[PDB]
Design a protein around this ligand. Structure first.
Ligand SMILES: Nc1ncnc2c1ncn2[C@@H]1O[C@H](COP(=O)(O)OP(=O)(O)O)[C@@H](O)[C@H]1O
Ligand SMILES: Nc1ncnc2c1ncn2[C@@H]1O[C@H](COP(=O)(O)OP(=O)(O)O)[C@@H](O)[C@H]1O
Ligand SMILES: Nc1ncnc2c1ncn2[C@@H]1O[C@H](COP(=O)(O)OP(=O)(O)O)[C@@H](O)[C@H]1O
Lengths: 55, 371, 371, 371, 55
C-alpha cells in the first residue's frame, strides 16, 4: 500500500509540475500582455489630455 | 385533500393528520433485530421489528436508533420507520397526501436533501415540506415572539423569534438531551450496585428517569438533604421483580442540563445558552424575549425545571425585568401541534414543494426560500 | 375649505389643520424595512413601516431618514411619509385641501420644484405653497422684527427681519444640528464602555440626549466641577437595564453648538453666527435685532441655552446695548404655529399656487412671485 | 537603556526590543486552566497555563482570551499574560526598561488608566506610553499621509492621517474581525457535517481559516463556480486524521468582512467604511487618501483582499481617481514594527510618561498631552 | 523511505498548487483590468472623436 499511494504521489507530482510550468509560462505571457496594456493605457491617457486641451 | 404531519424527532415518532389536536401514532423510533439463533421451525419469524413491537420483543432483539442527534445515520432503518408509520400505524397511502417533516436547526444539508429524495422517489408523495421544530412550537404556543427552548431527545436548541422574524445569528444548538441524560443515569446508578448494560436495559433506565427524576430548585441544599434525611428516596420495580431504590440521583440526572460538566462537556447549561441567545439578539427586543421564554420537547417535562430555569435566568438578567417561562402541560407534543396548525393554514398551500418542481430542479430545491 | 399645514423638517413630521393651536399629528419621519428572514407563514407582514409604527419595531427594521440636511434625498420614502401623514394620521383626502409646506433657506431649487410636482401630480392637491421656516417662527412669536435662530434636526439658520422685510444677504445657514449632536454623543459615550452602533440604537441615544443633556453656562468651570465632585452624574435605564451613568458628557454634547470644532467643523458657534448676521445687517436696525433675538426649533430646547447664548452675545455686542433672547416654552412647534396662522390669514388666500397656474407654467411657478 | 515594544493585540501578543526589525516573542494571548480532575499524584500539576504552552496542553484546558474587542475584560489573566511575556519569553526585568503599549481608537478610558496603573505598580517600569495602532502602521509603512485600515482579531478601524495630522472626527471603528470570522466559519462548517464546539476546537477552526480561506473577486460568480465545478475544494487534516473537505466555505467566510449582514450586523463592509471615512475628510486631501490606502493586521492577510477592496473602492469613488491599496507582505507585524521605530526615535525620548509624573498626577496623566 | 518520499512529494504538490492558483488569481485580475481598460478605451476614443469634430 505504501508503493501504491507512492505511485499516486509520484503521478500527482508529475501532473503537479505540469500545472506549475503552466503557471509560470502563463504568468510570463500575461505579464508581457500586462506591460503592453499599461503602455497603451498611458499613451491614451496622455492623448485624452491632449484632446481635452485642444477642445 | 389532507396533509400528514410526521414529527420524526430523535427517539419518538409522532405522526397524524393536519387538522387534529394531537398525533394519533406515537411510538419509539427504534428498529430491532434478533440476536439469538432461533430453534422452533415453523415460527416463521421476521428479521427486523419496528416501533412498538420491538419494545415488546426487547429481550430478544438489539435495539438501534436510526437518528443520533437530529442527524439520520441509518437510511435503511429510517426508511423502515417511515414505511411502518405510513402503512401500519396510520394506514394511509402516501401517494395521495402531502407530508410535512420537521428538522432541527443547524443540521447537515445532505440530511434534508436525502430526506426529500426519499419522500419523492420511494414513497412517492405529491408534495413535501421540511419545517424547523422551534417555529412550529411557537405556532402551537399561540405566540408570535419569544425565545423557544426545544429540548428533545437528540438535540437542544434556542431559536429567538420576534414578530415572526427569526434571528439566525442568535440560534444556539447544544448536543445534550434525554439520551445523554439516560446514559449518565445508567452510569451513576452503578454506585448502588445496579448494572444496566444491554441495549434493552437502556429502555428500563429511560423509564426510571421519566418516572422518578426531577430538577432541584437548589442543588447544594438537595445534596445536603439527601445526605442527611431519607425522605427523598423512592423505589422502582423492574420487569423482573427485585425493586431498586433511587436516592439523590433522582435529581443528579437532570442537573446535567444545568451543569454539562457532569458528562464532561465544555458548554454551559440551558439557562445560560438561553440568556446568551437573548444577549446576542438586539437591545430593544430583549424585554419581550425575557417575557416570552417558551419551553417544548420531552426533556423539559421534569418537575421543577420551569421554576429552576426562572430562578437562573432571573439571577442572570437585570433586576428590573419580568422574566416569565411558558411551560404548557402538552409540551412534549408542541412541535406536532404547531405542525398541524401550519399545514392546515390556507396560506401555506403555496409553500409546498410540489413533485414537478422537484423533478425539474433536483433535491437542491429544498434549501430555497422554502427553508 | 381648510388648508393643511405640514411642517416636515428633518426627523419629525408634524401636520394638522390651519386654524388650530397645535399639530394633531407629530411622529418621526423614518421609514423602516425588515432586515431579517421571516419564518412564520401567514404572518402577512408588510415590507416597509413608516412613522411611529416603525418605532415599535426598531429591533427588526433598519431605519432610514428621507431628509438629510433639509434636503430630501429619497423621494420614494418621502412620498410614503406624505401618504401616511395624509391618510393614516390625519385621515383627509388631499384632493380637497390646500397644503402649506415649509423648507429651510438656501436649499437647492430642485428640492422645492420636485416637492410641488409631487404634491400636484401624485397627491393631487388643489393648491399649495412653500414657506420659509424662520418667517413662520416670527409669525408665531407675535413679532414683526427680530433675528430668528431656527435650530431644527438637520439645519440651523439665522434670518434677520425688520418691519416685515427680510434681509437675504445676511441669512446664515449652518449644517450642524440635532442629528450631529446625536452622532457626537454616540461617539463620546464609548469613553465609558457603552456602544450604540445600530440605527435602532441611534434612537436610544437621541432619547438619552433629550432627557439628560443641558448647556453649561461656563464650560471650563463645569468641566472642573465634573472632574472634582460627582454631583452631575445621572443614570438612565436602557430598554433592558444595565443603567448607564453619564457624567460630563451631559453638557459636552450640546456644547458642540458653541464649539463646532468638537465635530471637526471649521465654522463658528451659533452665538457667533447670530452676531455675524447682526453685524452683516444695516446699522439702524441692529438695536432692534439685538432686542428681539428669537429662538425656535427642537435643538433650542436644552436647559440653559438661552442664558448661555445671552452671555455670549452680550460679551460680543457693545456694552451700551441690551440683549434679549426670546425662548417660548412651545419652541419646538413654532414653525407649525406660524404656518397655521399664515394659512388662516384671509389676505393669504390670493398667494396660493393654484393647480391651473401650475398646469400652465410648469413647476417653475414656485420660485416665481408665487413664492 | 532600551525600550520594550509590546503590541498586546487581542489574540496575539507580540513583544520585543525597540530597534529590532521584528518582534522577538509572538504567542497567543490565551490563559488555560485544567477542567478535569487529575489522578497522577506527584507530577505536580499547575493551575493555569499561559501562552504557547496552553496550546500544547490544549486538549485538557479551557482556553480564555483575556481581551475581547480591544478591551481587556480579565485583569488577572492580563497580568499573567504580561508576566509571562516579560519573564518567560523575553527574560528581561521591567524595572529597568521603558515600555510602549498599543491600543485601538475609541476604547474606554479605564482601559488605558488601569493599564498604566498596572505597568507602574505591579511591574514598576520606569516609564511607559500608549500609542494608537494605526499611527504605528503608518510609521512602519513609510508614509506620512494615508488612510490606514487595521483589521486585527477583535476590532477593525480606519484612521485617516494627512501630513502627520489625524482627522479624529473621521475615525471609524467596527467590531467585526477575525474572531467573528472564526465563529462564522464554525457555524458554517456545521452544515457540511463537521461540528467544532469546544474552545479547543475553536483553535483548529482558526487554523483551517488561516490556511484555506480567501476572498473572492466576484462573490456571485464564485458561488456559481462552486455550485457547478468541484475545482475549489481543498482538504484539511484534523489533529487526529479524518480529513475534512470544504468547498465554497473557503471564500464564504471572509466575505463577511464585505457583507457583515452574514453575521447579523447592520453596518457596512470594510470597503464602504473606508470610503465613508474618506468622504468625511476634507475635500482637498481625498485624492491623497485614495492614493495611500494602507492595510495592516492579521485579518487583512487573506489572498485576494487587496484586489477585492480595490475593485470595490474603485466602483465607489469618482472615475477620475487613482485608487491604490498598499498591502505589504509583513502586514501582520506592521503595528509592532512602527512601534519599534517610534520608540527608537530620539525626539520621542521626552514623550514618555515617567514614574515621577505618575506618582505626581495619578493615572489620569495618560490622557494628557502625554497621550 | 517510502513514507518519507511520499510526504516530500506531498509538500511539493502543495507548493506548486499555491503558485499555480496565485497565478490564476493574477491572470483573472489582469483580464478584468484588460476589459476595464478596453471600456475606458472605447469611452475615451468616443470623447476623442467628439472633441475632434467639435474642434
Ligand atoms: N416526564 C418526563 N420526564 C423526563 N424526561 C422525559 C419525560 N417524558 C419524556 N422524557 C424524555 O424525552 C425524550 C423524548 O423527547 P421527545 O419530545 O420525544 O423528542 P424526540 O421526539 O425528538 O425524541 C425521551 O428520551 C425521554 O427520556
Ligand atoms: N428637550 C430636548 N432637548 C434637547 N434636544 C431635543 C429636545 N427635544 C427635541 N430635541 C431634538 O430636536 C430634534 C428635532 O427637532 P425638530 O423641531 O423636530 O426639527 P425638525 O422638525 O426639522 O426635525 C431631535 O433630533 C431631538 O434630538
Ligand atoms: N494568513 C491568514 N489568513 C487569514 N487570517 C489570518 C491569517 N493569519 C492570521 N489571521 C487571523 O488574524 C488574527 C490575528 O490578528 P493579529 O494581527 O494577531 O491581531 P491581534 O494582534 O490584535 O490579535 C487571527 O484571529 C487569525 O485568525
Amino acid at each position: 500500500r505504501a508503493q501504491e499511494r507512492l505511485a499516486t504521489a509520484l503521478q500527482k507530482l508529475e501532473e503537479a509540475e505540469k500545472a506549475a510550468d503552466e503557471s509560470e509560462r502563463g504568468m510570463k505571457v500575461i505579464e508581457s500582455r500586462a506591460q503592453k496594456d499599461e503602455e497603451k493605457m498611458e499613451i491614451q491617457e496622455i492623448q485624452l489630455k491632449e484632446a481635452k486641451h485642444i477642445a | 385533500t389532507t396533509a400528514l404531519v410526521c414529527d420524526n424527532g430523535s427517539g419518538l415518532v409522532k405522526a397524524g393528520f393536519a387538522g387534529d389536536d394531537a398525533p394519533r401514532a406515537v411510538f419509539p423510533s427504534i428498529v430491532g433485530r434478533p440476536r439469538h439463533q432461533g430453534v422452533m421451525v415453523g415460527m416463521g419469524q421476521k428479521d427486523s421489528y419496528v416501533g412498538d413491537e420491538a419494545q415488546s420483543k426487547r429481550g430478544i432483539l438489539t435495539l438501534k436508533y436510526p437518528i443520533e442527534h437530529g442527524i439520520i445515520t441509518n437510511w435503511d432503518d429510517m426508511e423502515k420507520i417511515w414505511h411502518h408509520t405510513f402503512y401500519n400505524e396510520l394506514r394511509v397511502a402516501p401517494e395521495e397526501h402531502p407530508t410535512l417533516l420537521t428538522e432541527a436547526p443547524l443540521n447537515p444539508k445532505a440530511n434534508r436533501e436525502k430526506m426529500t429524495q426519499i419522500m419523492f422517489e420511494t414513497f412517492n408523495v405529491p408534495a413535501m415540506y421540511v419545517a424547523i421544530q422551534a417555529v412550529l412550537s411557537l405556532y402551537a404556543s399561540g405566540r408570535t415572539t419569544g425565545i423557544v427552548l426545544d429540548s428533545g431527545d437528540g438535540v437542544t436548541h434556542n431559536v429567538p423569534i420576534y414578530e415572526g422574524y427569526a434571528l439566525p445569528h442568535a440560534i444556539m444548538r447544544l448536543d445534550l438531551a434525554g439520551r445523554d441524560l439516560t446514559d449518565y443515569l445508567m452510569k451513576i446508578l452503578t454506585e448502588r450496585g445496579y448494572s444496566f448494560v444491554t441495549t434493552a436495559e437502556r429502555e428500563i433506565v429511560r423509564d426510571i428517569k421519566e418516572k422518578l427524576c426531577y430538577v432541584a430548585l437548589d442543588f447544594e441544599n438537595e445534596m445536603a438533604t439527601a445526605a442527611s434525611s431519607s425522605s427523598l428516596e423512592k423505589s422502582y420495580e423492574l420487569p423482573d421483580g427485585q425493586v431498586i431504590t433511587i436516592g439523590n440521583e433522582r435529581f443528579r440526572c437532570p442537573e446535567t442540563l444545568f451543569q454539562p460538566s457532569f458528562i464532561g462537556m465544555e458548554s454551559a447549561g440551558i439557562h445560560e445558552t438561553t440568556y446568551n441567545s437573548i444577549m446576542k439578539c438586539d437591545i430593544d427586543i430583549r424585554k419581550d424575549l425575557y417575557a416570552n421564554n417558551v419551553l417544548s420537547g420531552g426533556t423539559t417535562m421534569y418537575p421543577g425545571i420551569a421554576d429552576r430555569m426562572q430562578k437562573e435566568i432571573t439571577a442572570l438578567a437585570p433586576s428590573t425585568m419580568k422574566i416569565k417561562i411558558i411551560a404548557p402541560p402538552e409540551r412534549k407534543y408542541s412541535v406536532w401541534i404547531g405542525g398541524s396548525i401550519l399545514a392546515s393554514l390556507s396560506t401555506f398551500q403555496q409553500m409546498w414543494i410540489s413533485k414537478q418542481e422537484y423533478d425539474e430542479a433536483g433535491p437542491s430545491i429544498v434549501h430555497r426560500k422554502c427553508f
